[PDB]
Design an enzyme around this catalytic site. Sequence first.
Site, PDB file in Angstrom:
ATOM      1  N   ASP A   1     -11.400   9.091 -25.661  1.00 24.75           N
ATOM      2  CA  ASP A   1     -11.106  10.493 -25.881  1.00 24.75           C
ATOM      3  C   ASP A   1     -10.984  11.072 -24.449  1.00 24.75           C
ATOM      4  O   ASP A   1     -11.311  10.393 -23.467  1.00 24.75           O
ATOM      5  CB  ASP A   1     -12.241  11.166 -26.677  1.00 24.75           C
ATOM      6  CG  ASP A   1     -12.031  12.626 -27.038  1.00 24.75           C
ATOM      7  OD1 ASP A   1     -10.858  13.052 -27.148  1.00 24.75           O
ATOM      8  OD2 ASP A   1     -13.037  13.340 -27.212  1.00 24.75           O
TER       9      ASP A   1
ATOM     10  N   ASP B   1       0.866  -1.124  13.915  1.00 22.35           N
ATOM     11  CA  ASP B   1       1.400  -2.173  14.781  1.00 22.35           C
ATOM     12  C   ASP B   1       2.652  -1.677  15.512  1.00 22.35           C
ATOM     13  O   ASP B   1       2.542  -0.738  16.302  1.00 22.35           O
ATOM     14  CB  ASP B   1       1.573  -3.497  13.993  1.00 22.35           C
ATOM     15  CG  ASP B   1       2.034  -4.682  14.807  1.00 22.35           C
ATOM     16  OD1 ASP B   1       1.221  -5.209  15.588  1.00 22.35           O
ATOM     17  OD2 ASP B   1       3.224  -5.029  14.714  1.00 22.35           O
TER      18      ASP B   1
ATOM     19  N   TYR C   1      10.626  -7.054  19.447  1.00 21.54           N
ATOM     20  CA  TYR C   1       9.945  -7.657  20.606  1.00 21.54           C
ATOM     21  C   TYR C   1      10.898  -8.059  21.731  1.00 21.54           C
ATOM     22  O   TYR C   1      10.432  -8.456  22.791  1.00 21.54           O
ATOM     23  CB  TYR C   1       9.244  -8.941  20.161  1.00 21.54           C
ATOM     24  CG  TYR C   1       8.011  -8.724  19.314  1.00 21.54           C
ATOM     25  CD1 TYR C   1       6.799  -8.373  19.905  1.00 21.54           C
ATOM     26  CD2 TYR C   1       8.033  -8.921  17.947  1.00 21.54           C
ATOM     27  CE1 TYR C   1       5.646  -8.220  19.139  1.00 21.54           C
ATOM     28  CE2 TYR C   1       6.888  -8.770  17.171  1.00 21.54           C
ATOM     29  CZ  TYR C   1       5.696  -8.414  17.773  1.00 21.54           C
ATOM     30  OH  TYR C   1       4.578  -8.244  17.013  1.00 21.54           O
TER      31      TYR C   1
ATOM     32  N   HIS D   1      -6.564  -7.231  12.099  1.00 16.08           N
ATOM     33  CA  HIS D   1      -5.264  -6.655  12.430  1.00 16.08           C
ATOM     34  C   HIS D   1      -4.631  -5.918  11.243  1.00 16.08           C
ATOM     35  O   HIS D   1      -4.007  -4.880  11.448  1.00 16.08           O
ATOM     36  CB  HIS D   1      -4.300  -7.732  12.970  1.00 16.08           C
ATOM     37  CG  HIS D   1      -2.965  -7.182  13.349  1.00 16.08           C
ATOM     38  ND1 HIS D   1      -2.855  -6.191  14.318  1.00 16.08           N
ATOM     39  CD2 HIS D   1      -1.740  -7.435  12.826  1.00 16.08           C
ATOM     40  CE1 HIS D   1      -1.577  -5.895  14.374  1.00 16.08           C
ATOM     41  NE2 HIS D   1      -0.858  -6.610  13.502  1.00 16.08           N
TER      42      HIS D   1
END
Lengths: 546, 546
Positions: free
Chosen positions: A8, A334, A465, A523
């Site tokens: 309920d 990151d 990178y 990390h």
Amino acid sequence: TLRAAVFDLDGVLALPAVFGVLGRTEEALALPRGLLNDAFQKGGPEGATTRLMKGEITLSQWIPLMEENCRKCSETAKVCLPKNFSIKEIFDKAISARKINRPMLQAALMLRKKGFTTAILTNTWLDDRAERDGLAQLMCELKMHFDFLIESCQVGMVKPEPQIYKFLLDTLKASPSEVVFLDDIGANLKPARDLGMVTILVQDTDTALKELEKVTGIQLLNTPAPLPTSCNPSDMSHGYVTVKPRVRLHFVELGSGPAVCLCHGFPESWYSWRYQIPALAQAGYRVLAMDMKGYGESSAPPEIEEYCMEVLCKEMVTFLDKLGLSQAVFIGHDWGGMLVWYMALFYPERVRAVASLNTPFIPANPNMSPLESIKANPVFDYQLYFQEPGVAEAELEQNLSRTFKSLFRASDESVLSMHKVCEAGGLFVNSPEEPSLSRMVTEEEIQFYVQQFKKSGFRGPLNWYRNMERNWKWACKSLGRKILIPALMVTAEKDFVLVPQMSQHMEDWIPHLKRGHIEDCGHWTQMDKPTEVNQILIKWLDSDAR
Amino acid sequence: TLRAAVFDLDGVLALPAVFGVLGRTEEALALPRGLLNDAFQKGGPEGATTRLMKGEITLSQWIPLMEENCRKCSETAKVCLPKNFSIKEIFDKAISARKINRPMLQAALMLRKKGFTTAILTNTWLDDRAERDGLAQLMCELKMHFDFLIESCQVGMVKPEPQIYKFLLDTLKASPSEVVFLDDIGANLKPARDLGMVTILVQDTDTALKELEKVTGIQLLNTPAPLPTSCNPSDMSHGYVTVKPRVRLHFVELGSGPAVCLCHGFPESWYSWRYQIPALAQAGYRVLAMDMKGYGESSAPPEIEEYCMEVLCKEMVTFLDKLGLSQAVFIGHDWGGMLVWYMALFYPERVRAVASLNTPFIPANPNMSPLESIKANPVFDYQLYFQEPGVAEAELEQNLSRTFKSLFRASDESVLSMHKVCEAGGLFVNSPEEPSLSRMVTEEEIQFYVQQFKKSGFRGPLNWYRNMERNWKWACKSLGRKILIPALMVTAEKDFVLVPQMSQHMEDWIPHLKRGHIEDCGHWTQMDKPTEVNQILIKWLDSDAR
Ligand SMILES: Nc1nnc(-c2cccs2)s1
Ligand SMILES: Nc1nnc(-c2cccs2)s1
């Protein structure tokens, strides 16, 4: 043997029940007992309240009718009725007071997790009040956790009438002996019992949970703290924006309010924010979790220069422009954390606020080449392995399943050092070919990342990178600037690459910097400690990002 | 022969210029003349202002430096400086005061329309003030109208240095003799002239517009009122939500703020709202313009019952749930207008506000079959033609180009009566096979609708008309209810099907009903009278939907 559980709403999933309201208002206002209560129930089935619960009339139509019943409950009460008094005022307040009973909701989530079919069966109304949003918000949050929500006003049937129970069994596609039914009202329980359904009279939560777990055979009470709600990819709103002729950015959108843009790192997905998206949406924000360029459903152009920070930031600015957003709060992790600091440095007007998990703000070192700077420390050795095109793509691409299982681990479980990577000649040279599945992740979750990386691979992601020199030159322009917009830096104790100590000197460029610290966190902050991350971000958003 | 036009922002596209600010503040505060002005310019190229305009430092870093210049402009001014005084306070106010110069913006839009390359070249700063959103909002609105926006702080070059002009020519990919340059500063114009660029000294808008049009040969001043901004489909954010296993709804999203959901009618597209989407987004709302079920990029299931109102409304509720929206303002036209009234009647808690263009709220007639009701009047005869599956699909599908050109017409141009349709045995039996293109539409616009209908055809769209009996039964449940949430009904004088008189009795179910009336407006309200529609909706949203 049960497979379905029914709850309920008033007095079961949401507390306190309105039933107490009329009673409590009577006591405070010293009117005869049950008087307010008779007004509510005058005429029973043919009365204004039954018409309201059947969807015949709306709540605003009902208010004058109930007020009607107070003319005569009182005439037959022989008691004076106060002015300054509004039926509407009492109900507004009582509804505002109703909040989700979290231990009850937790028990329903646990049952559903164990293959149970869960449903909400309630006697409710069609709410047209100026203040209806509060209730609608509550229903929106609750309903997504259940297989079904059966409301009396939509179905035109009310409890305790037997047709609604026969209706519920139909929706459930289950036999009564297979159903647990929980209600705070004795009369509403009785018809379920007649069908042979298992019933629980809910008076106080702990006891009802006690009865529920002994009948189910599942641990519901005293259970370890649960994980926040996570996204099912198939059930999200998927967004696509062309930022330029060959570039299309994909995003997932949830909630309403100020725009919060989530930027993942390497080698992630919008899906890395699965625990944050519903929590941030529930907290009153419009979450846009991106598939950054080179990832998932977003365009992944082969050229290295397409991934330099200057180009990446311009695209994020175009994305906002094309969505018609003058600003967004930018939250990054990151590589996304790095981009997010540069968004704050180069487009402060487009950034409402900036937050970074693990990634410290790294100012460019003039008079020191990024190669010398990266080379100073053994932690960033993996970045050199990523330099030559094809080497890292070949290793990461060979077994996607192994790649994600090796990388996505809590600090205790780590299978890879990340030093002597160039010397080892591999990110996975010391790694099992069939890694153990981490506590942070599920087999299904791993499979999702595998599915995403099968489309474009690691080339675009690794290109982030490969713009070291270019990024250094661009960042040298911001050497005289400071970040003076609201900024939050969140550090993880057990991140051995993006170490907390690396952020010590941040206050020099970011004077009003606020901090968050997470202990025993590797990390992968978002999946590692979801509850803590959500608490820090929400508390920060509410104080600093409106 | 020109093909490119360049505009300054301060004093050209945005008024009043800040230059006046220091001067005007001097007069009000009775400080020596140009004193405030010397502080701004102290050190010229090596000074704080040049560093700020080159992106070397942010605006908040600049404030204390400028304040620095007021220490000494004044020491060398031999004049007392008042307390309660803030450089920040003056600049905040001046920037807030800057608004778009609409006649100038209109001239740029017109040039671009005639194949001109337009650009904004400005001396600006990196704004990190707590109040930066105001300026960012202004830039967001302006930039989308130009091919390029060149800001000094991003490029690191300032006017009047010659490298920026050589930079601009590069971006333009044009020779100086082909460039018109408009600026309010004499010194900044001079280097453009040296390159042989056409220049305009902007002092007052009408005169500069006079010089601009005589050199361009294009009418810019006294031009008829322009059409609102329209969407380019390729430049929008496209959203997709699965509401159920076989049903996916597509939508276009623009802006931030309260959610406004746009519901098109038959046989339309989210694209039918092209004039409303940017106007509503600029007005401070988050626009979600749907491709309703059976249309465009949305799922088009073949079954008739998939298009009954009850099913259509549940899907709209699921769509909100999946986007994490507790409420949305619902704006509908034609069939979308009908759905929108039923959303208000059956889900008042999920509807922030309801607005309908042309479509009156039609209550179900108990004791009169929808067939008798529809049959009473000759206007709704086309609905009977739509009844039998395949007949109308075959006619509408044969030539998509002819279909849209015949249907999309202003009241004056109409090629089809819509009566004797069943008798004529066609919607296009009295129509040219190669219809004239209406003033409301472009050949490119027609082609867009053709492209959309090629995917799924007319079956799903025509199915909305094939659930008469079902819709009647469902609507009979709302017979006791009233719409008490904010509601707006907009009538079009020249709609011969959805006639204004049909809405006369609406106040009986909708007591607080607000009205809008549009003269000389056919069935296609959105494209017919875009300016009026936008004014009515915006004025209504601001007063009634927050
Ligand atoms: N490979 C790279 N490592 N760090 C990079 C940085 C870019 C901008 C600031 S630091 S590029
Ligand atoms: N064909 C149809 N014409 N009108 C219809 C209506 C449905 C609901 C209210 S009116 S269905």
